[PDB]
Each structure stands twice: as structure tokens, then as C-alpha cells.
Amino acid sequence: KRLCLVCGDIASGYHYGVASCEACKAFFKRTIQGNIEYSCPATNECEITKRRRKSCQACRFMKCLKVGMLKEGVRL
Amino acid sequence: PKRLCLVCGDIASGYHYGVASCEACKAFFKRTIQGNIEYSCPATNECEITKRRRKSCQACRFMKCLKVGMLKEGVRLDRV
DNA sequence: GAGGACAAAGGTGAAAC
DNA sequence: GTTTCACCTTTGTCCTC
Ligand SMILES: [Zn+2]
Ligand SMILES: [Zn+2]
Ligand SMILES: [Zn+2]
Ligand SMILES: [Zn+2]
Ligand SMILES: [Zn+2]
């Protein structure tokens, strides 16, 4: 089953160049559209899992970038 | 269509934790579960819960939330 | 596979307690 | 010092395009 490369939830298909779920798709889209900056309250190593993806916006967004979600896939 | 809070009789803003409820009972239930807060009734666990008296007993207000069907599991452990 | 509508989650802080 | 609640923001679903 296609897994979301960000969080391990079931992927709905490719989004912004990468196998991802609707939740991570929507989160990445909002983050880019608003130029929203987050910062980790731990040390930028928060676990991102389907059951625990909302614990840190900063680490979730960094994981999106890491797995190859593309800023320019989001329309201005 | 106008809907009433099943807990206290205030105007409901929507469904919260599975039940028609106002913003106050939603917030109260959310705080209670997030903190695993235990309350105790000073009377005999039959305090009336109304718009005018929802503040008088945390214990009875929380038990009423459970009674009308508010769901502990609708409160996410996944948060900041 | 892009974005948007939107219910129902979540967070907040002045005022109430 | 802690708790309440009106008014916010964010999340994730499901839909048109
Ligand atoms: Zn399989
Ligand atoms: Zn995901
Ligand atoms: Zn973090
Ligand atoms: Zn209520
Ligand atoms: Zn009581």
C-alpha cells in the first residue's frame, strides 16, 4: 500500500512530487501558501508518525522537504 | 436550525466530541481530558447543569458530558 | 493531482472565579 | 493562581476542476 513518505498514513497518490496522504498534502500546501515559519521546541528530531504527526509543525514541515515535497508544486 | 447544548441548555455552536454542545462545554470537556483532571462533587453527585449554573460543579458537569455521549477519544493526544 | 469548502478538531487570554 | 468561554486558527475530508 502506497505509504505517505512523511507520516506513514495511507498515501492518496503523488502530491508535490511525493507519495503522501491528504493530511500531509494539505499541511504542506497551507505552510507554503502562507510562508508560515515554525520552530521546533525540542532539537529538530521529532518523530513524525500517522498517530503523532501534529506534535511539531517544524519537524513535520522539515520532513516534507526531506522526502522531496516541492515548494514550486504549490501555485502562487 | 437552532440546536441546544445537550449538557447545559446554552445555544450549541455545532457537534463537539460526537454531541450537540456549546463552546463552553466543548472547551470544558477538552480541558478535562487533556489534563486527565479528576473532580469531586461536594454535594451528592446530582448538581443541576444549566447555562446559569454550569460552573457550580465540575464533577457533575463532566459526568453530564459523558452521559449525553461526549467521547473521551475525540480529544487528540496528537497535539503540541 | 491541483485547489477550495468546511465541520470539527485545536489554541488563546481577558475576565471571572 | 487557576478556570472559564468567546473568538479565534488549523486539521483533515471529500469534493470540483
Ligand atoms: Zn497490501
Ligand atoms: Zn502524511
Ligand atoms: Zn520539532
Ligand atoms: Zn454547554
Ligand atoms: Zn456536583
DSSP string, A12-62: -EEETTEEE-HHHHHHHHHHHHTT-----SSSS----BTTBSSS-HHHHHH
Q: What is the largest CA-CA distance in chain A?
A: 33
The CA distances from residue A53 to A22, A24, A27, B3, B76, in Å, are: 13, 9, 10, 34, 11
| Residues B79/A55, Cβ–Cβ less than 8 Å | yes
Resolution of the coordinates, Å: 2.2
For residue B16, give the C-alpha cell: 463537539
For residue B80, give the C-alpha cell: 503540541
- CA–C1' nearest nucleotide, residue B76: C9
Which among A72, A73, A45, A70 has a CA at the least distance from the CA of A60? Answer: A45
Search chain A and give the residue with CA nearest B77.
A52
CB atoms within 10 A of CB B73: 9
Quick one: B60 exposed, middle or buried, by C-beta within 10 A (0-12, 13-18, 19+)? buried
E strand or H helix that includes residue A5: none
Experimental technique used to determine this entry: X-ray
Q: Are strands A18-20 and B14-16 parallel, antiparallel or unpaired?
A: unpaired
DSSP B56: S
Which among A33, A18, A22 has a CA at the least distance from the CA of A65? Answer: A18
A window 18-57: Cβ near strand D (< 7 A): 21-27, 30, 34, 36, 53-54, 57
Among A41, A53, A57, whose Cβ lies nearest the Cβ of B78? A53
> CB of A53 within 8 Å of any CB in chain B?
yes
Rounded-to-integer distance, Cα B69 and Cα B24, Å: 16
DSSP A3: B
3-state DSSP call for residue B54? coil
Residues in chain A closer than 8 A to B80 (CB atoms): 41, 54-57
Q: How many helices (H) and strands (E) does chain B have?
A: 2, 2
Instruction: Look at the block and give the residue holding cell 504542506.
Output: A28
Amino acid at A25: K
